[PDB]
Design a protein around this ligand. Structure first.
Ligand SMILES: *[Se]c1ccccc1C(=O)Nc1ccccc1
Ligand SMILES: *[Se]c1ccccc1C(=O)Nc1ccccc1
Ligand SMILES: [Cl-]
Ligand SMILES: [Cl-]
Ligand SMILES: [Zn+2]
Ligand SMILES: [Zn+2]
Lengths: 153, 153
């Protein structure tokens, strides 16, 4: 019943389209789409705080963390709202994304509209990496592609 | 107090950065920035309904019009929320944008976050073109660049 979309763009080309749908404001968000141009394996997948792509993906700032928690994986209670874990690219460099998440929302103070979706260079260690960066960024490395999360029809 | 930003990109040379600031939710929104790569003269400048760039600036849909009005200019009572008139490009193809608008907002029903800002091929006739299309689009022609309006620091 609310529909949101993000077009991911970066050098490669790394490029993707991610759709978000929420039936009800108290319900989960379905996240689906595809990303191409990736290296085979895990890629950290996060909502970042700012929908600011003026200087590319760096402008997006840190993970979206409205509740001031540590970084974790999507299944963790201790996570940032923006912690969507990893997407997985096949040998052809395509990640087919299929996520259901209870913590992001398309309304209220967990709302992700106007924020940035980022796909990262490396795996997100989901806060289990055992260094200070693990519980902040998950050590997922550079930002390969991003886009501002927008309202869809 | 609320800051939002939009990076305009398209299929051609046109690129720009637009900033929006709103001190108070009941106050005007200051709009400032720059668009480069334009032909000299007037170019329509609108907030479109969808923050959807799936197939480029076409996917942004029609002018943002939550109050079901006809198309006009920004100083008109009869306007779409998204009707920000024209920007003007100089001999070098640079439009220095400086708008203050009382109808757009960065909160509430007129909120433009997660919508698309579009700069057009031709002048917007501000609903004074003398044909039916004038009262819908202002006859501003194709979409040269666009971007989703995102939350800034
Ligand atoms: Se959603 C979303 C995204 C960006 C900015 C504001 C919101 C929003 O809906 N806020 C809100 C609406 C109603 C009640 C609380 C918060
Ligand atoms: Se602002 C904003 C941006 C994106 C989606 C929703 C909103 C929003 O705050 N909606 C809203 C809140 C309160 C009253 C009307 C509308
Ligand atoms: Cl990061
Ligand atoms: Cl149009
Ligand atoms: Zn995080
Ligand atoms: Zn209009």
């Amino acid at each position: 019943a609310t529909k949101v979309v993000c077009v991911l763009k970066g050098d490669g080309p790394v490029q993707g389209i991610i759709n978000f749908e929420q039936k009800e404001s108290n319900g989960p968000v379905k996240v689906w789409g595809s990303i191409k141009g990736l290296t085979e394996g895990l890629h950290g997948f996060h909502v970042h705080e700012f929908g600011d792509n003026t200087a590319g993906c760096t402008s997006a700032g840190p993970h979206f963390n409205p509740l001031s928690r540590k970084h974790g994986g999507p299944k963790d209670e201790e996570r940032h709202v923006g912690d969507l874990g990893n997407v997985t690219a096949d040998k052809d460099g395509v990640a087919d994304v299929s996520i259901e998440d209870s913590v992001i929302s398309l309304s209220g103070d967990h709302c992700i509209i106007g924020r940035t979706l980022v796909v990262h260079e490396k795996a997100d260690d989901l806060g289990k990496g055992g260094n200070e960066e693990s519980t902040k960024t998950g050590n997922a490395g550079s930002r390969l592609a991003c886009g501002v999360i927008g309202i869809a029809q």
